[model samples]
Target chain A: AAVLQQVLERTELNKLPKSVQNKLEKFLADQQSEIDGLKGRHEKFKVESEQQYMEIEKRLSHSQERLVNETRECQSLRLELEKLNNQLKALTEKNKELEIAQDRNIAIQSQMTRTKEELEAEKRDLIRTNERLSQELEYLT
Target chain B: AVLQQVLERTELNKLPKSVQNKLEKFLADQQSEIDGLKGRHEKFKVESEQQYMEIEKRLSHSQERLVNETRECQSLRLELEKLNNQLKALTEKNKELEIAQDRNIAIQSQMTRTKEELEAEKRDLIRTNERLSQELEYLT
Candidate 1:
């Protein structure tokens, strides 16, 4: 509110004689100028307050931007961890399936070797009888 | 004339605010009355001047009356002197007429005495003539 405002003029003192009035008006002007100077100083204080408020707001905005960037980086790290966990589960499942298939193929190879030995013994006996028969036929010749 | 008159007032010396305005108005009225008194005094002086002129006129009138009275007294004194001179001349003339009347009476007395003597002599001659006539008759 403009509660305390006053103005004085030198002309208000002009009704007196010229010499006396000049001195009186000069005094009035001096006091009025002093009041104006005080008003100017008050306005300067108001402008200084506004500038300080703007500076504080600028610093607050910078801090808020920094906090937001930190939160974004934290979320990215969480997502990367979740992806690594999924890759680890897929590798464990593949290692278990390869171990089971290797066990089944070794059992089949043992059974095939026992059957081939039995057939080779039977063929040896047949070959011995044919040799003897041949020798005898040569002698007759 | 251009001297400054400073006025000083204190809080304790200050008049009551309630009636201060009324007192000031009363003072202004008193000042106006004083001015009226000065005007009346000037009028009184003018009236005294008029009275002085009236006194001068009265003095002049009194002087004129005194001059007329002086002239009248002088005329009366002249008449008295003329009457005195006429009385003196009449007394001297009366003395001269009395002496002339005494001389005329003396001359009349002397003429009467001479007439008586002549009558006596005539009587004597007549007696002598009668005696002579008687003697002559006797002789014849």
Candidate 2:
């Protein structure tokens, strides 16, 4: 804002004291020019500071945005890790069950084979007995 | 007197002396008011200018500080991105490790099963040999 100087003049200059009148005239002459200079400097500072304010504001806003994005990304990563961990636990349990079932199957298979071999040996013994009995009958007849 | 002649030329005598005195008093009061205004205006000008100067200095300082902070913030943001990428890679590595662990478990299970199966077969063979030996002895 600029200030304008208003100079008031006296019609009866001769009626006033020389010293006081001279000082008043001098003040009036200097007032307008000095006020203009003050206004100019004030305007300059105002403009510069306004621009700086805007720049700082923009920087702050951008920084906040980056923080937000980074926070979101971190959150997502944490969630993903949690999910993977849960998945791993389930898979590990599944593998453990499979291992136990495989162990039982192997044991059963081994038992079945052993019993079959024993049955074969018994059959051989029975055949031998039957043949011996037949030979005795023939001899008696 | 020069003052008296100057007053008369300015037609001060046309008015009553009382009126003239009053006029002079009024002019003196107006002069005093103007002087006070002048003193106050000068003080205000100096004070306001100083204030503006300080503001400008601080504003410039603030601008510089903000500039540095903004640059630093950007670098940190870039660093964060790098860290994020590294985290992603690590997560992938973690998944691979999990798979490897599962595979290791599977292999161990298979190994145990095979060993047990072998042991059972060995026992069966021993039993069969004993039966054979008993039969041979009976024949003898």
Candidate 3:
């Protein structure tokens, strides 16, 4: 009777025919197995998205760390720029001094002209302020 | 220091003047030095002018060059800033992130529907069994 009660479907012979009762029990047991497998598959699929997000987070951290390192490098670059700045300042001062000398008397102008006629070689040989700056910058770089 | 020594000798107008033969020799030497300097004066003047032009050209281009070159630093700085902002954007996206369970929902719903279908089947089957039992008992 207990065995017959377990069968969800049956017909004939005062209770379930033994063959049908056995099959139904087996099918119900199989149904439980399918339920477990389906639930596990779904949980596994859901967890994969979490894994994807975690990897993205890890890459984000690496990127953040790299950005910090580059920012540190920029600090050194700024100091180097300041160092180069002083070189620019010196060149500017020298240029100003040269300008003042040129703006001197018309007597000075005549004086300069008379000397330049004989000075073509010396003129070519004189180091330019700009050229010096370029050479210094190139050397430092 | 080398230039100082040369300047001391080059300008002859510094020589002392007086009335005696000794003074006359000094005066002649002064005249000689002054006359000689005039010939060399053209060379010095031209040299000075060359220096002036060179400086002018340098000043013209150098400030611009410095500005342009220095400007590269700021540009790089801004690029870094842009990079940081990109990180912030990514960070925000990460902040708003949610765990995925879409497949779980589907699986669970499928499981519930299946369970409900099985329950219906079970009920119908039980009723069929009860009917069969009742008929057999009645015949006996």
Candidate 4:
């Protein structure tokens, strides 16, 4: 009776025919095995899921770090580009100033040339007049 | 980090099957999302880096060209200033010559006046001689 009480406590089997009791215990044993199998599967799934989650987190960290580094590099490039553009702008303005100065230079050069030509023509005329006057003085003498 | 509660690990088997299913589904969804994030992140890294390299190359080239241009422009500007100074000097010298030319014109005009006076006296002498000859002939 104590053994039967123990069996009742463990498997909740009742005082039935011996064949029916054997069949019921077998069924209980099969159910326990199924539960154990399900428990094993659950533990395995949990372990694998945790491993996958950690791996995913690691990859995410690497990707984020790369993104930050690349973003910084991109910013540096943009700043460099802007600096170069400013330099180019200043250079272009200087070139413009040079061009204007050169234009003034050309105008001055042309004016100088015209003035020189006029002076040279006056010099020739003066020489011719001097010669003619010297001949007239000789003839009067 | 604060130690707040006495936490116990929950056994998956003890949880309801529906809850277990839901948890697994959520985990799978998280993994899927993480995978998508990873894919996008990888593409972003590759594409952005490549684009950055291309931009860097272009900017570097531009910087080099601008440097050269600035150097050349500076030299050209100096040359232009020098030429302008030379032209200014030439103009100053021309102005001096113009002043000399004005003096020369005055000298030429005085010489011309003296020559005209001499010619007018010669004409007056010839006319007086002609009158003397005609009067002498009338007397004879």
Candidate 5:
């Protein structure tokens, strides 16, 4: 007889004999204890989980704050690096300007050298002409 | 007649096993509710743990990157120093070249004036020589 039923209606429980009454009452007591134990455990677990989650939430808040701080520090460093790179470019450009100016100065030097050489040649020619004039005038006299 | 009087009301040395089983049905539903609650709490804990770990990992990664970036910044500063020195050296070199250029201009000015002066003297000498040659021819 595989018979399964739902609940103990109040009339059916009263139909039990004295010993059966005690046994049913004992089963009810046992089930109540089990319910109490489960409730206790769930309460403890809920409180523990709430407290643990509070601590974890606090830690995560601080962790995110640190992340922003770290990024901010890195951001400052990147800004400094960018500024340095700009300075480097400007400095190199200055050297490039110096190189071009030096070349221009050398061109001026070459022209100055040629002018001095022409002046020396003219001086020697004038000396020879003056000497020749003196010899011819001496012979005429 | 006394023993028949003691035979009182109801009794149960035997009850249906299924009836006892039915009496516990109320407790079974309560246990089921607890089980559902436990499943919900445990699942929530598992997911929360994963989220907490992910946040921690991201923070750690960012901190490590910050360390590297700080080191690179140090390198950049040192390199910047060298670049500044190079700029100064370039400026010094250009200053010297400027001086050289000014001196050449001075010499150019002096040589230009002297060259014309010598040309004037040369022309006068040539004119005097031409007059002397004519005098010698006339005397012969």
Candidate 6:
């Protein structure tokens, strides 16, 4: 799904003249090995990146389910608020219970605000991470 | 200024290392001097020849006058052979002038011919100089 590094071929070495290759064997022997090593490192990094991406995708799916659950909880809270309002009107004599209910309403508003802020921060982090992955993928391609 | 020709700019600094300094000194001290000397010599030579021509013209006029006087004396002797006793002196003087005129004509003619030959030689030298100059410029 994403890339971290790429292995580029040593096309120049294959095209070297036979005379040059013969003369260069002593020098190119070490160079060729070094090039191979570089390619191996690049491939390893790419594979590790792919594995990390898979993990990130799984986490993204989990986050999406959590967001859906949070939304359903918000709807249930809205229904409970309607029920509490009707109950408070019927119990107009119980001032203490109304004060507790008002505190509960404030607590629910604070929780909703905190959850929205957390999700916004998470969204920003996700966008940044996605952009970084896209850059690495472009480099590999 | 309007009639002035546009002379090309010379890259004097770019002159070959081999010939630069000597060529510069030569152009500075010798080139114009040599040209002036040649022009002066030509002028002097022409003037010398002109002076010689004028001398010859004067001599020729004197000879012509003497011939006329000699003819008048001869005619007078024919009329009075005895009274024309001065014929001998006149004849002697005329003969002397003829001899002098002949010598002058001979020498002047030889000089005139030599002058013409010298002019031809001068022309040859000038041509040779021009040819050398042309070749030198061409080589450069």
- Using TM-score as the measure, which candidate wins? 5
User: Which residue runs does candidate 1 get wrong by more than 4 Å?
Assistant: A1-141, B1-42, B110-140
**Interface RMSD, in order shown:** 99.9, 11.8, 66.9, 17.1, 8.0, 82.9
* Model 2, span B103-128: residue lDDT tens: 65666566556556655765665566
Tens-place lDDT per residue, model 4, B16-117, is: 445335434533444455556556556655664565566556555655655555555555555555655655655565555556556655655665565566
Q: Say which prediction, candidate 2 or candidate 5, comes out ahead on TM-score.
A: 5
lDDT of candidate 2 over A74-138, digit per residue (tens): 56665665666665666666666655666665575566567556655655665565556545545
Maximum-lDDT candidate = 5
Residue-by-residue lDDT tens digits, candidate 3, B18-109: 21233234334544554555545546456645655655555545555545554665676665565556555544443333111333345445
For the predicted complex of model 3, DockQ is 0.00
Chain B TM-score against the true chain B, each candidate: 0.47, 0.49, 0.43, 0.46, 0.54, 0.42
lDDT of 3 by residue, A8-110 (tens): 2233323433453354345444444555565565466446645654655565555555555655666766775566456555655655554454444334445
Question: Which residue window of length 10 is worst by lDDT in model 4 chain A?
Answer: A1-10
Question: Which candidate, 5 or 6, would have the higher lDDT against the true structure?
Answer: 5
Native A-B contact fraction in model 3: 0.00
Q: What is the lDDT of residue B106 in candidate 1?
A: 47
Q: Docking quality tier of candidate 3?
A: incorrect
Question: Which 10 consecutive positions of candidate 3 chain B have the poorest summed lDDT?
Answer: B1-10
Error of 6 at B25 (Å): 56
Tens-place lDDT digits, model 4, residues A27-134: 444444555565565566556655655665565555555555555555555565556556555655655565565556556556655655665565556556555554
lDDT of 4 at B82: 60
List pairs with backbone clashes in candidate 2.
none
> TM-score of each candidate?
0.29, 0.35, 0.32, 0.36, 0.48, 0.25
Q: CA shift at B46, candidate 1, in angstroms?
A: 3.4
**DockQ for each numbered candidate:** 0.00, 0.05, 0.00, 0.02, 0.19, 0.00
Off by more than 4 A, model 4: A1-19, A78-82, A109-141, B1-140
Number of clashing pairs per prediction, in order: 0, 0, 6, 0, 0, 0
The segments of candidate 5 whose C-alpha lies over 4 angstroms from its true place after superposition are A1-70, A73-102, B1-56, B75-79, B97-99
lDDT of prediction 3: 0.47
Q: Give the best candidate by DockQ.
A: 5
